[PDB]
Ligand binder design. Structure first.
Ligand SMILES: CC(C)=CCC/C(C)=C/CC/C(C)=C/CC/C(C)=C/CC/C(C)=C\CC/C(C)=C/CC/C(C)=C/CC/C(C)=C\CC/C(C)=C/CC1=C(C)C(=O)c2ccccc2C1=O
Ligand SMILES: Nc1nc2c(ncn2[C@@H]2O[C@H](COP(=O)(O)OP(=O)(O)OP(=O)(O)O)[C@@H](O)[C@H]2O)c(=O)[nH]1
Ligand code: SF4
Ligand code: SF4
Ligand code: SF4
Ligand code: SF4
Ligand code: SF4
Ligand code: FES
Lengths: 219, 60, 183, 780, 110, 124
């Protein structure tokens, strides 16, 4: 579907996360939508890239693999379909017209309020020969956080994919060894998830203490 | 204290009154603590203060 | 050691004074930087200042030779075991300087990942604010540690001081109870 | 549900006929700036902040007042440059006279004016002239401080105090630029719902004196919560800084309380910190109450309770979460093998327990607040909604204003609450209520579909009253609901904390019910002997036939015969008290356990409609709830109560489920003849004022200073018969003692004197030791 | 602005927001306390840090706090080269290689 | 004989809280409990070196030297060291409590029954 992804639904004015400190202002319903798919004439080389991609992949393979294309602030995001990620990445790296040699890493981002698409892995790719860059985005559910690892295509991802797992639990199936890299192997939970509490302690003061920022009010 | 990224300032306001006035106006900082084992010296507090009551000396 | 078994008369006093002098004047740090504060510690050793002036040029690489531990950085959870191992592997007497807000109390990083003060894992002799503490502040803290070292008891005096400090410490009301003008 | 379709900005939506443009734009995600608008207040369009361009309209129209018409086109500030200009100009004009007070204004950080001046305001002032100035702040009551300069004169406070609450003790005053919200001259604001104005003001004009300068929004730990005080079960938001609760805002729950509170719920939170709190387990030794460990205290309590065995009674009180009541009941059933369980720490009767078993217990979510608003006719028996469950009063007033709800009260005199409802009195002396109910079986208003009959807890005090009300409900077909005064009463009933009941409403006298609970408790069999009501338990203990009492959060002064109750607790050889604060029972008890207050414990209440009101522990503390205390006392006694937390108690209550079998018989008590008072004597009527001297209002002198001045009330005929005059201090009396209050001659049945039940200086139970409906002497 | 009493808000600004400019006061208060709220969206922006392509993935949920800020620190990726540049060589040469990578561990571990 | 429990914390209120959770006789099927209270790491260490303790409760939040560090030290330094219980000021501190090798860990605020049960488990 072309409808945007709503990562959150703000209720009420002033960004209240709960009932709100003034009465009568909580009735607004503002969904938090990320940008939807760009219409078609993607700016700059983006079209030149995507068209080329659509050429190297078939119409059927391209349609099954690329879920969405989002140009935002002159940055091209290819919301790629899970499972098909290794094929698309191989096409990007190998194709002379794309030739995105440099995958700069993998970053997990958690959207608990995005149904069936809770965990997004972002792959910044750069083509040095063509002086281009794009960002693949693969969405996985929370209940099935498995994503295909790009190791065979981008070895640089091995540590990134590890950190992202450690921090989000995104299981990059096919990765040689998804061991926690930052946190201890015996650590419980995945800290960068929103469900994981900040785990701070109150700051002490003569006769008082300030609870961590995650407990106190916010807007 | 609002602006402090480190939660290194604790402020409790209280009323100025004729029998006891500490600052011009209706409010004053009765309690003012800085936890210097949390203060990172960023200076955001200073930029936050609207009265220049808070400044940063060069004493270190 | 036998030096502490001397009778509590003038011999033990003078030995304490000389030993404190020497230990304050030769307070070799361990080569144990962690973070930002480690860079500022190197800057303190750098020529603009001279930590060597205070007999502290030798950043001891091996914990065995090191008499002082400038934590100088943020102790993550995964580092607390290593930091404690290094501390325990120094040979006594040894003091610990919690350089920076991160080392002393966790600093701005009030989080799961950070231990919130090396005091959790090792006894702290002196706490040093700053983020990072500028090298002049590090030298100030080290001089305060020198003052602490010189006035250090030994033997029977050490036991008496431990007893007195324990008795005094049992009475201080906790920080959370020092409600002043706080309503 | 005629739906009208219209385009706001470029987009299109369809909304119910009559919906306001501002509501539609809210629904579609568009923040039209607004101050005077309020969803629950009748639109006034005063501030003109919410202007929008509407197709075919020359002028901008206040979106808050523009009803949606079919095929309309509207363009907000997001797409109409003209509407943007209108809103920004209104914003500027709104800020020119506003004080530069944000650092010192309590509303700073949570101010709608600040936020909407950021989103919809000019970068900087254009106003180089002189600002309007008022001397400020000025108190309009003991609780509310008014800052007129910050007042944007939106009239939301005034509109609330008129429409929502029938308390127009403030109004817009003066004229022109000088217009200001104000009280009359010195007559204080004086409304049980005054705090709502503080929460309704879109600026710092109205602030809570208690919360003044206490904190800024970033310094608050904020948690959802439920009020502890009456069966209304309002959603609230508890804010605490430094571990101390600073305020309790109204929250938002349209199915219960909309966005409202009463002053009791909003400010009566300091009770847990007045310095009387029980910090550690206490033990009686040498006649003195001494701090004790948990280990030693549990050892002693288990020893005593095992020594008493089945010669024990558990007074559960009404200050308990559903889980706490369930633990008390289960503890009584197994750990003590007794059925002497009663949450009624108040005037009560066996007929009350019978009625609660017959109609209330197990019958969840019948009559609902939403139903109240649409009931064509509402009858009130022994129930003063303003004084008892003020939010029920708010809903009834809302029904009166919107859907023409007709309200009838069987009461001695028209209470201010009833008058605000436009309700009609059925003047009847206390005790004579059953006759009133029996005389209403032919009333056509109750025969109307959706008619409702609300019975207050006080109706239990009158013999034959509850059975009469049940008969009336059956004969007319109107839905009958019973609305207690304490938040834990209904949860206690659902917890089976009555002598005749078990969890889920299943009766004790039913063998199959006993088997179901015994299985669900993995136990052989529950006791079969009929339990003893609280009055029975207390009279028994005063006789020395009771071996030990377990009193959980009960104030003896609230019982019908407090002298009897203090004697009962004193004579009992072993008294185990789970108390939040020191009291008569804690003072006279042998073992005292501290139980965490509501702010620091997870749990759930039940409101009068049966809706669960769950809440998480806002404060985190070493304190433990009644649940854990009872569970570990049982464990020390050697029985697995299996209630380590409120979550387990909720799971067990779900497992036991509703009774569903042969519903217990109706009470059908005979309407006993009322006493007749001779000359110099009258029948006592009374109900607890909302802001009475209750223990949980302690530590909040402002809220007390906002309480209604206690007064005796009489018919001019009866005052003349006693020789008194209005304003003269009339004294009522009985053997125990006398209560003296200024006389306020009231239109009411002759031979009846009304006193506040437990207002300061009244304390009718303690002073007189009689219930409502009892004959009491009177004099000048 | 500095003064005889140390670094502080410039007295001109204090006068502006506390004596004259109400909108100025509101803006100071809100931008300091709540801070700007960024439109929702994602953006990956890279710079040429001394140690390489320091990238930042930034995600905003329309709020005043960032929804996500992930640093692709160049040092973290460069440390993948310890195997390549150390294996097979002398330990003294491995030290030189690791130094040549110039890993700043703060960025590596973040 | 009476059991001696070393309760270590520089916060007097935490020591009182521990002494409240554990009565003079916890679990009346158990011996009497004797409390030696210490508010400094050196004194806690010296008392441990004296020995004869059945359990030591070390406040993980002790200011100049945390109870977890003291726990690791006492296990490394006293032969036949008595079991150690730690009070942790944070749920995330559990991992460090695991590293401290204390037989059990009780999060702050001290839950009386939880602490009593933990102690009974260690002293049994
Ligand atoms: C009336 C009258 C005239 C009487 C005179 C009596 C008198 C004074 C006697 C003189 C003869 C003596 C001394 C006899 C007494 C008996 C005796 C010899 C005892 C020895 C006891 C002993 C083994 C040790 C105690 C100390 C002592 C005095 C030992 C000998 C002298 C020395 C200097 C020995 C060890 C010290 C030493 C050489 C090295 C210490 C270790 C280091 C690393 C040194 C410092 C140092 C070095 C070397 C770096 O490389 C470096 C590089 C970059 C930055 C910093 C550093 C740094 O800090
Ligand atoms: N065991 C227990 N006791 C409580 C709890 N909450 C309050 N209490 C105590 O219960 C006692 C009696 O409370 P109430 O019967 O409600 O008296 P009140 O505060 O005047 O309330 P009203 O009945 O409306 O007048 C008080 O002294 C409190 O200390 C609780 O959660 N558990
Ligand atoms: S310098 Fe000021 S703003 Fe920054 S951390 Fe320290 S107290 Fe807070
Ligand atoms: S205290 Fe500040 S300067 Fe020192 S290591 Fe921590 S973050 Fe860096
Ligand atoms: S009411 Fe709002 S705008 Fe006015 S001074 Fe207070 S915070 Fe500032
Ligand atoms: S006091 Fe508040 S609610 Fe009343 S008119 Fe003024 S701004 Fe509006
Ligand atoms: S009406 Fe009752 S439940 Fe609602 S806020 Fe007031 S006291 Fe609390
Ligand atoms: S909100 Fe519509 S005119 Fe005020």
């Amino acid at each position: 579907g072309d409808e945007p992804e709503i990562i959150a639904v703000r209720r009420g004015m002033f960004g209240n996360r709960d009932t709100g400190d003034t009465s009568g202002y909580g009735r607004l319903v503002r969904p938090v939508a990320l940008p939807g798919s760009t219409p078609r004439p993607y700016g700059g080389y983006f079209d030149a890239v995507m068209d080329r991609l659509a050429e190297v992949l078939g119409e059927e393979r391209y349609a099954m693999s690329i879920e969405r294309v989002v140009v935002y602030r002159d940055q091209l995001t290819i919301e790629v379909s899970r499972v098909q990620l290794p094929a698309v990445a191989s096409v990007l790296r190998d194709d002379p017209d794309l030739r995105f040699e440099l995958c700069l890493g993998v970053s997990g981002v958690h959207y608990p309020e995005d149904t069936g698409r809770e965990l997004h892995a972002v792959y910044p790719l750069m083509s040095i020969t063509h002086n281009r860059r794009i960002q693949l985005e693969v969405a996985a559910p929370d209940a099935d956080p498995h994503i295909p690892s790009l190791y065979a295509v981008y070895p640089t991802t091995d540590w990134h994919e590890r950190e992202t797992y450690d921090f989000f639990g995104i299981i990059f199936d096919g990765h040689p060894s998804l061991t926690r890299i930052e946190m201890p192997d015996d650590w419980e939970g995945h800290p960068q998830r929103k469900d994981y509490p900040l785990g701070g302690i109150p700051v002490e003061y003569h006769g008082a203490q300030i609870p961590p920022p995650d407990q106190r009010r916010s807007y | 204290a609002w602006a402090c990224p480190a939660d290194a300032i604790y402020v409790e306001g209280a009323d100025n009154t004729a029998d006891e006035r500490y600052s011009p106006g209706e409010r004053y900082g009765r309690v003012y603590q800085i936890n210097y084992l949390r203060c990172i010296g960023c200076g955001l507090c200073i930029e936050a203060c609207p009265t220049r009551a808070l400044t940063m000396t060069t004493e270190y | 050691g036998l030096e502490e078994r001397l009778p509590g008369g003038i011999l033990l006093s003078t030995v304490e004074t000389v030993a404190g002098y020497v230990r304050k004047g030769s307070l070799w740090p361990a080569t144990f930087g962690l973070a930002c504060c480690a860079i500022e510690m190197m800057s303190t050793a750098g020529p603009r200042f001279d930590i060597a002036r205070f007999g502290m040029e030798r950043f001891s690489a091996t914990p065995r030779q090191a008499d002082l531990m400038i934590v100088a950085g943020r102790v993550s959870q995964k580092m607390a075991p290593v930091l404690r191992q290094i501390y325990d592997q120094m040979v006594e007497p040894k003091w610990v300087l919690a350089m920076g807000v991160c080392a002393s109390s966790g600093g701005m990083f009030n989080n799961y990942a950070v231990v919130q003060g090396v005091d959790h894992v090792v006894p702290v002799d002196i706490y040093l604010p700053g983020c990072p503490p500028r090298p002049e502040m590090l030298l100030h803290a080290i001089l305060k540690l020198h003052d602490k070292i010189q006035q250090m008891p030994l033997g029977v005096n050490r036991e008496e001081a431990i007893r007195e400090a324990e008795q005094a410490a049992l009475a201080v009301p906790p920080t959370i109870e020092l409600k002043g003008l706080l309503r | 549900v005629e739906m009208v379709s219209l385009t706001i900005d470029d987009h299109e939506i369809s909304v119910p006929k009559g919906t306001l443009l501002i509501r539609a734009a809210e629904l579609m995600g568009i923040q039209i700036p607004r101050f005077c608008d309020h969803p629950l207040l009748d639109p006034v369009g005063a501030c003109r902040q919410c202007l929008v361009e509407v197709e075919g309209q020359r002028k901008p129209m206040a979106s808050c007042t523009t009803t949606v018409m079919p095929d309309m086109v509207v363009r907000t500030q997001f797409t109409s440059e003209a509407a943007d200009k209108a809103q920004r100009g209104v914003m500027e004009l709104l800020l020119i006279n506003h004080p530069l007070d944000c650092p010192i204004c309590d509303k700073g950080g949570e101010c709608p004016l600040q936020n909407q001046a950021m989103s919809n305001g000019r970068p900087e002032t254009r106003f180089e002239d002189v600002k309007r100035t008022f001397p400020k702040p000025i108190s309009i009551s003991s609780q509310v401080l008014l800052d007129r300069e910050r007042c944007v004169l939106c009239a939301r406070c005034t509109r609330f105090s008129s429409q929502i609450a029938g308390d127009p003790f403030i109004d817009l005053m003066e004229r022109g630029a000088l217009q200001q919200v104000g009280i009359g001259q010195d007559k204080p604001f004086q409304s049980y719902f005054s705090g709502n104005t503080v929460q309704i003001c879109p600026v710092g004009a109205l602030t809570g004196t208690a919360y003044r300068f206490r904190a800024r929004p970033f310094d608050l730990v904020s948690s959802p919560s439920v009020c502890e005080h009456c069966a209304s079960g309002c959603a609230q938001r508890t804010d605490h800084r430094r571990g101390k609760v600073l305020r309790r805002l109204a929250g938002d729950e349209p199915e219960v309380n909309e966005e409202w509170n009463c002053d009791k719920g909003r400010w009566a939170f300091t009770y847990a910190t007045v310095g009387d709190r029980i910090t550690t387990p206490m033990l009686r030794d040498g006649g003195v109450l001494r701090p004790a460990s948990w280990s030693e205290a549990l050892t002693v309590a288990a020893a005593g309770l095992l020594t008493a065995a089945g010669s024990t009674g558990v007074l559960v009180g009404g200050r308990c979460t559903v889980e706490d009541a369930y633990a008390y009941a289960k503890f009584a059933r197994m750990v003590l093998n007794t059925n002497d369980v009663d949450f009624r720490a108040r005037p009560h009767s066996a007929e009350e327990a019978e009625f609660l078993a017959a109609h209330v217990a197990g019958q969840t979510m019948g009559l609902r607040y939403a139903e109240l608003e649409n009931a064509p006719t509402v009858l009130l028996a022994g129930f003063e909604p303003e004084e008892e469950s003020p939010i029920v009063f708010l809903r009834l007033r809302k029904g009166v204003r919107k859907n023409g709800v007709q309200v009838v009260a069987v009461a001695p005199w028209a209470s201010r609450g009833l008058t605000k409802l436009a309700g009609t009195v059925v003047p009847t002396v206390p005790g004579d209520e059953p006759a009133a109910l029996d005389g209403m079986h032919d009333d056509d208003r109750l025969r109307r579909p959706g008619a409702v009959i609300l019975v207050g807890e006080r109706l239990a005090t009158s013999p034959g009253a509850l059975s009469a009300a049940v008969r009336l409900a059956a004969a007319t077909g109107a839905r009958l609901a019973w609305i207690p005064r304490r938040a834990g009463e209904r949860g206690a009933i659902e917890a089976g904390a009555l002598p005749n009941l078990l969890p889920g409403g299943r009766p004790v006298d039913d063998a199959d019910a006993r088997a179901e609970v015994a299985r669900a408790w993995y136990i052989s069999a529950l006791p079969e002997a009929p339990g003893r009501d609280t009055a029975a338990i207390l009279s028994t203990a005063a006789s020395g036939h009771l071996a030990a009492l377990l009193v959980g959060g009960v104030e003896l002064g609230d019982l019908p015969d407090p002298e009897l109750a203090v004697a009962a607790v004193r004579t009992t050889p072993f008294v185990v008290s789970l108390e939040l604060r020191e009291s008569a029972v804690t003072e006279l008890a042998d073992v005292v356990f501290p139980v965490a207050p509501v702010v620091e414990k997870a749990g759930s209440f039940l409101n009068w409609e049966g809706r669960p009101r769950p809440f998480a522990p806002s404060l985190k503390t070493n304190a433990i709830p009644d649940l854990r205390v009872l569970h570990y006392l049982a464990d020390e006694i050697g029985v697995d109560l299996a209630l380590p937390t409120a979550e387990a108690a909720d799971a067990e209550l779900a497992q036991l489920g509703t009774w569903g079998g042969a519903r217990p018989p109706a009470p059908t008590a005979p309407p006993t003849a009322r006493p007749e008072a001779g000359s110099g004597q009258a029948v006592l009527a009374s109900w607890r004022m909302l802001l009475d001297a209750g223990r949980l209002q302690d530590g909040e002198p402002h809220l007390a200073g906002t309480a209604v001045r206690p007064v005796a009330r009489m018919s001019a005929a009866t005052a003349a018969g006693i020789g008194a005059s209005d304003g003269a201090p009339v004294t009522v009396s009985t053997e125990r003692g006398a209560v003296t209050l200024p006389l306020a001659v009231t239109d009411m049945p002759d031979g009846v004197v009304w006193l506040p039940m437990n207002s300061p200086g009244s304390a009718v139970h303690q002073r007189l030791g009689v219930t409502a409906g009892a004959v009491v002497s009177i004099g000048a | 602005k500095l003064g005889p009493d140390g670094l502080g808000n410039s007295p001109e600004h204090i006068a502006k927001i506390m004596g004259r400019s109400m909108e100025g006061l509101i803006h100071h208060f809100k931008l300091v306390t709540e801070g700007i709220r960024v439109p929702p969206g994602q953006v990956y922006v890279a710079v040429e840090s001394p140690r390489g392509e320091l990238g930042v993935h930034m995600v905003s949920d329309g709020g005043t706090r960032p929804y996500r800020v992930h640093y692709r620190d160049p040092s973290f990726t460069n440390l993948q080269a310890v195997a390549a540049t150390c294996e097979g060589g002398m330990v003294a040469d491995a030290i030189a290689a690791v130094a040549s990578i110039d890993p700043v561990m703060g960025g590596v571990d973040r | 004989a009476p059991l001696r429990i070393l309760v270590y914390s520089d916060n007097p209120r935490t020591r009182e809280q521990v002494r409240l959770a554990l009565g003079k006789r916890i679990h009346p099927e158990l011996p009497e409990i004797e409390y030696v209270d210490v508010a400094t790491a050196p004194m806690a260490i010296s008392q441990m070196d004296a020995g004869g303790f059945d359990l030591a409760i070390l406040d993980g939040e002790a200011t100049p030297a945390g109870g977890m560090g003291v726990a690791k030290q006492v296990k490394d330094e006293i032969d036949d060291c008595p079991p150690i219980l730690v009070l942790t000021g944070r749920a995330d501190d559990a991992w460090l409590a695991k590293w401290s090798r204390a037989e059990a860990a009780v999060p702050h605020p001290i839950d009386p029954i939880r602490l009593s049960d933990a102690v009974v488990s260690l002293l049994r």
